[PDB]
Design a protein around this ligand. Structure first.
Ligand code: TWI
Ligand code: TWI
Ligand code: CL
Ligand code: CL
Ligand code: CL
Ligand code: CL
Lengths: 130, 130
């Protein structure tokens, strides 16, 4: 349940993962979602704070004084909606569903969103298949 | 960095804790905070989604159609501000700074906020000192 942290303070082991699980439950039920991300013909509802916490691109967008208040954000029309959906799921769960058929689109999308460890992981998996 | 999850899917070990760390950085910089919690003479800015993810009381409050849009939430005047501050810090970090001088107020506050594992932990630490 808990342990003594390096700073001699009590820390709860599953707290962060349980908070992320609850944030994903709010997303699934469309509770307190405050933005819609438009990717081509697709729309994805989400929480701006989670998007900012999980992306250099969203962090830059929502810290801009003009943009921070937009309810709709349109992504570059070159972005693959399935690649975005996989990454949005990863943001809210820590699980990255990489497959042979989606890895190029996921990698291109992670580069655009500035999710650097995800890009590096995609590169390693591609390199192993070559 | 990552591992094979029980569902044969790639999982990133530090993802949840790193997201929580970024949410705490947004709180420290007052970025996208959407509510002020008033406890006696004290005010605490926060994100409603994090409060809901970390409290049965806030989950009930912000799922109410009338309340979900309030920018200010006043707590019961009996609530100790330091006890609330300690729990708000715990929500955003997983670290619970329990001390002999604050444990009764932290426990009373965790009961009011419906943070049940925190209450149980407080009870065990009190029991060990008796
Ligand atoms: C460049 N970059 C990533 O490469 C990145 C991010 C990432 C998040 C911010 N946001 C920050 C940064 C600082 N302070 C804040 F307050 C925020 Cl919100 C800025 C750049 C980022 N987030 C991780 C999340 C934490 C585990 C990710 F999902 F794995 C994708 O990787
Ligand atoms: C009764 N109760 C706690 O006792 C509790 C909560 C807690 C959170 C919700 N919120 C929920 C529930 C279901 N689905 C949602 F979508 C939400 Cl947001 C509802 C009741 C809760 N949250 C944890 C966080 C996860 C690690 C806590 F901070 F440790 C304090 O303990
Ligand atoms: Cl808008
Ligand atoms: Cl736009
Ligand atoms: Cl209000
Ligand atoms: Cl109120």
């Amino acid at each position: 349940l808990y342990f003594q942290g390096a700073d001699s303070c009590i820390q709860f082991t599953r707290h962060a993962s349980d908070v992320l699980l609850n944030l994903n439950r709010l997303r699934s039920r469309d509770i307190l979602t405050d933005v819609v991300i438009v990717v081509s013909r697709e729309q994805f509802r989400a929480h701006k704070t989670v998007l900012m916490a999980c992306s250099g691109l969203f962090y830059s967008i929502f810290t801009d004084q003009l943009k921070c208040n937009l309810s709709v954000i349109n992504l570059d029309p070159e972005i693959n909606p399935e690649g975005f959906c996989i990454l949005l799921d990863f943001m809210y769960t820590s699980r990255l569903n990489l497959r042979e058929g989606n890895i190029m689109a996921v990698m291109a999308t992670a580069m655009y969103l500035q999710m650097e460890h995800v890009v590096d992981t995609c590169r390693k998996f591609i390199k192993a298949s070559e």
